[PDB]
Structures are given as C-alpha cells and as structure tokens.
C-alpha cells in the first residue's frame, strides 16, 4: 500500500541524424552508439527489478526496451500509445529547414503545448492519448505499489516528447509550465512516484517527480568505439 | 541566446538519513557512505570544470563541497542562505514520531509548499532567502555563461528541501505546483539552465530543468567497504 514508482526511459541515439532532424513517428533505427547507450541504461535500471516493461512499437524504443528485458527476464509489452508525437509536416526536417519556412514558429511551438503548426499532434494531444495507459496499469497491476514489493517500478520505454508531455500531465502542471522540463537525453530516464489514495480513483493519485533526465555514465573509450562502428569514415 | 548552467548538489548521506530522522538545520555529520558518495559525485561533476562552488554552512553539505573543491582546485564559498529548511518541532524526530504526534501532517507538508505545521520554515520561505544568492551570482560573475567557456557550471552544495524550493522558484512554477519536485538522493545533483538574451535583467532569464536528481553510479565493491567501515565504527 505504498507509492507506485513509474520509470520512463528514452531510446538511445538513432542512425539518422545526430542533431536537430525531427523524427516524430518515422521508424528510425538505433545506431551502434544508441544500442550501447541502451545497454548502459539497462545495466542501471535492471538492478531495480521492474514489475513490467511497456514500449512504443517504434524500433528505436523497442530495441532499447529489449536490452532491459534481457537483463530482467521480462518480456517487452508493446503499446502504440507510447509512440512519439506525430510531427506532421515537420517529420524529417531540421531546425534550419523549419526556421526557413516559418521564422519564429518553432520557438512559439516549444512554449505552447496546445499548438501543432505542422498538421500533427500537440503535446496536449500526446498526453491525452498516453495517460490512459497509465490509468489502465493502475487498474490492472495489483502488485504495483503493493505490500509485497512496493518499490518495483513499471518501466515505459518511449521518446522525449511523449515522456515530457505524459510527465507534465501526470504531475498536473498547468500547460503554461510544461516547457519547464528540458529535453530528455539519449537513453536517459525519468521517475515519477504516485502516492496512495483512497478507493480506485486514478485522478486521486498525486504524482511527484523523483528523477528527470538521469543517465548512465559511459566511458569515452566506449563512446568512441561505438560511434566508429557505424561508419567507414 | 546564451545559457548559464547551475548545478545543485545534495549532501551525502548521514546517520539521520538512514534512521528516517528529520534533520533540518541540525548540524549532523556525513556517514562513511556519505563521504564515499560525495567523492563519486565530485568525480563526475569535476569533469564539467565548475566555475565556482557555494555551500551551506551545515557540515554535511560543506564536507560534501570540500570533496568537489579538492577534485577541482576551487575554493568553497560558504553561504547560510543555502541551509536546509528549518523544520521546527520536527527536528530530530523520526517519521513514525511525527506521524504519532500529528497524523497527516507529513503528508500535508509533502503536498503544500506553504505548509509548516512544525513551526519552522515553509518551502516558500526557503526559496525566498536563497534565490537572492542566484541573482547576486548573475550580477557579479561575468564569466558565468560567458565568452571563454560558457558551459562551466556554478555549483551550489546544499540540501534536498532547499534544492526543490529554489529550483521551483527559478522555474517560476506557481507555488501550488512546487510539490511536483520531490526528493533528492545521497549526493545526487540537479541542473537548471538559465537562458537569456543579452541585455536582460535577472527576472528576464528563463530557467529550464535540465536534470533533476541524477546520481553517480557506484560499484558494489565500494558500497561493501563503506558499509564495513560504518559498521566497524559502531
Ligand atoms: Ca558497462
Ligand atoms: Ca513559409
Ligand atoms: Ca552504417
């Protein structure tokens, strides 16, 4: 009857861009460096005995999640509600390309979680479609926060936009303050705690931010190696 | 647009932490593990080449800051504005003692940054006394976020209550939402970035939460020695 720990892990680096090319729901793959980052995060998070792992179906997230599944003996459940924000006309574009089409729009966008100037989803939309998964897991996982092993976390493996929107919504931050959360890094993780409440009211659970954007330390020699494995230059 | 990086490091573990005994402004000592974890965090944070270090005068924070000063070669400035929340009549009491004397009070306090049923400070009081240190540093450290090495952080070494209150205030979250920022762990750290356009005043800096409550990974071999050293020093 304790607090429910909820961990959210962002995928590692993809083989696509290493910069500002927005991905959205494009189904890009991890680079060798991103796979190494996923191992490093799984080494830390595995020690905490997750209760279950749920991943976005996008390969960059799923393959990250499998590294944690291998280290915990858990199967990776896949839920399309954990997909990254659909970025509409902006998927596959760099900041430079967006800024040339509409100067000022990208920066107004970061500060208005209700806006989707691209034909895709706003951050509010993303929270609205992912929050029901957390409510379902509260209803369906009686061991989560239970008396036997109350600190075993549910782990969600997903994407930076999803994690920021879902965390801000669970925390009940006013939408004006959603930009307070800086972007999640490569294979970084976040932890929220949902504190006990009478009855079965999900809305009565009060969430608090325990960890935002923590990461595993990885040696420079390993980072150099994994980056090099991907290229012949 | 430039950015100033601000790192806040919590003190290492004390015996009161292990015992779930509220500390507040009591001047408790680092345990053997607290010293060890402070070294490990200094190893991580030292690589960032901090610009300067300011620490609370409470020894658990100061002794943590000294490990970072030794690793970096920097002096540790001391500022009482970085002291932990004064917890009033709760200082020295365990969670169970508080819950027996005032059931629901600890929970109310966790959910309300204006609440101080213990007679000490609220988190609003703690932010109000500590935020001026950050404005003073902005006004008096032209190198911070400056030309040569813009990413070198200012490091404040303090306490979990202070760090949550000061961070929420810098982010300008409404007070109602300050309880969204929870605890900080044993020598864990938080990082905010202050973004500003050249010419702006302190209030025009927009702060963002880059990292909340990150930690250094420590090997099971070094946890087992600090446990043996804490045990053998009964
Ligand atoms: Ca490793
Ligand atoms: Ca245009
Ligand atoms: Ca390749």
Curated annotation (Swiss-Prot), chain A:
What, per the annotation, is the impact of changing residue 10 to A?
Loss of phosphatase activity
**What is known about temperature dependence?**
Optimum temperature is 45 degrees Celsius. Is active between 20 and 50 degrees Celsius.
Quote the record's note on pH dependence.
Optimum pH is 7 (at 37 degrees Celsius). Is active between pH 4.0 and 10.0.
Q: Where is this cross-link: Isoglutamyl lysine isopeptide (Lys-Gln) (interchain with Q-Cter in protein Pup)?
A: 47
EC number per UniProt: 3.1.3.85, 3.1.3.70
Write down the Gene3D superfamilies for this protein, in alphabetical order: Phosphoglycerate mutase-like
Q: How is its activity regulated?
A: Progressively inhibited by cobalt ions at concentrations between 10-50 mM and by copper ions at any concentration between 1-50 mM.
| Gene Ontology annotations for the cellular component aspect, listed alphabetically | cytoplasm
- Which reactions fall under this protein's catalytic activity? (2R)-2-O-(alpha-D-glucopyranosyl)-3-phospho-glycerate + H2O = (2R)-2-O-(alpha-D-glucopyranosyl)-glycerate + phosphate; 2-O-(alpha-D-mannosyl)-3-phosphoglycerate + H2O = (2R)-2-O-(alpha-D-mannosyl)-glycerate + phosphate; (2R)-2-O-[alpha-D-mannopyranosyl-(1->2)-alpha-D-glucopyranosyl]-3-phospho-glycerate + H2O = (2R)-2-O-[alpha-D-mannopyranosyl-(1->2)-alpha-D-glucopyranosyl]-glycerate + phosphate
Q: Which GO terms describe its biological process?
A: dephosphorylation
Source organism's superkingdom? Bacteria
Q: Which residues form a coiled coil?
A: none
Gene Ontology MF, one = mannosyl-3-phosphoglycerate phosphatase activity
* The keyword Nucleotide-binding belongs to this UniProt entry's keyword annotation: no
Which keywords, in A-to-Z order, does the entry hold?
Answer: Hydrolase, Isopeptide bond, Ubl conjugation
EC class: hydrolase
Q: What are the positions of the active site?
A: 11, 84
User: Which SMART domains does the record associate with it?
Assistant: PGAM
Q: Which family does it belong to?
A: Belongs to the phosphoglycerate mutase family.
Q: What is this protein called?
A: Glucosyl-3-phosphoglycerate phosphatase
Species this protein is from = Mycobacterium tuberculosis (strain ATCC 25618 / H37Rv)
Curated annotation (Swiss-Prot), chain B:
Q: Which reaction does it catalyse?
A: (2R)-2-O-(alpha-D-glucopyranosyl)-3-phospho-glycerate + H2O = (2R)-2-O-(alpha-D-glucopyranosyl)-glycerate + phosphate; 2-O-(alpha-D-mannosyl)-3-phosphoglycerate + H2O = (2R)-2-O-(alpha-D-mannosyl)-glycerate + phosphate; (2R)-2-O-[alpha-D-mannopyranosyl-(1->2)-alpha-D-glucopyranosyl]-3-phospho-glycerate + H2O = (2R)-2-O-[alpha-D-mannopyranosyl-(1->2)-alpha-D-glucopyranosyl]-glycerate + phosphate
Q: List the disulfide bonds.
A: none
| Record keywords, A-Z | Hydrolase, Isopeptide bond, Ubl conjugation
Enzymatic class: hydrolase
The positions flagged as active site in the entry are 11 (tele-phosphohistidine intermediate), 84 (proton donor/acceptor)
Please tell me which positions the record assigns to the cross-link Isoglutamyl lysine isopeptide (Lys-Gln) (interchain with Q-Cter in protein Pup): 47
Question: Could you state one GO cellular component term attached to this entry?
Answer: cytoplasm
- Activity regulation, per record: Progressively inhibited by cobalt ions at concentrations between 10-50 mM and by copper ions at any concentration between 1-50 mM.
The answer to whether keyword Ubl conjugation applies is yes
Q: Biological process GO terms, please?
A: dephosphorylation
Subunit structure of this chain's protein: Homodimer. Dimerization of the enzyme is essential for its dephosphorylation activity.
The record describes the protein's role as: Involved in the biosynthesis of mycobacterial methylglucose lipopolysaccharides (MGLPs). Catalyzes the dephosphorylation of glucosyl-3-phosphoglycerate (GPG) to glucosylglycerate (GG). GPG is the preferred substrate, but GpgP also exhibits low dephosphorylation activity on mannosyl-3-phosphoglycerate (MPG) and mannosylglucosyl-3-phosphoglycerate (MGPG) in vitro. Shows only trace of phosphoglycerate mutase (PGM) activity.
Which protein are we looking at?
Glucosyl-3-phosphoglycerate phosphatase
């Amino acid at each position: 009857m304790r607090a429910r720990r909820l961990v959210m892990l962002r995928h590692g680096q993809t083989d696509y861009n290493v910069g500002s090319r927005m991905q959205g729901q494009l189904d890009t793959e991890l680079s060798e460096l991103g796979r190494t980052q996923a191992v490093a995060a799984a080494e830390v998070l595995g020690k905490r005995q997750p209760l279950l792992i749920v991943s976005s179906d996008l390969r960059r997230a799923y393959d990250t999640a499998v590294k944690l599944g291998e280290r915990t003996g858990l199967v990776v459940r896949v839920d399309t509600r954990l997909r990254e924000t659909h970025l509409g006309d902006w998927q596959g574009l760099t900041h430079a390309q967006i800024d040339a089409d509409a100067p000022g729009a990208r920066l107004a966008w970061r500060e208005d979680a209700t806006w989707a100037p691209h034909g895709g989803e706003s951050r509010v939309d993303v929270a609205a479609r992912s929050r029901p998964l957390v409510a379902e897991l509260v209803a369906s996982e009686p061991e989560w926060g239970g008396a036997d092993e109350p600190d075993r976390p549910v782990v969600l493996v997903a994407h930076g936009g999803l994690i920021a929107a879902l965390s801000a919504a669970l925390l009940k931050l006013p939408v004006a303050n959603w930009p307070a959360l800086g972007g999640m890094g490569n294979a970084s993780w976040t932890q929220l705690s949902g504190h006990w409440a009478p009855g079965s009211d999900f809305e009565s659970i009060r969430w608090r931010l325990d960890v935002w954007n923590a990461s595993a330390q990885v040696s420079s020699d390993v980072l150099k190696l994994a980056a090099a494995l991907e290229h012949h230059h």
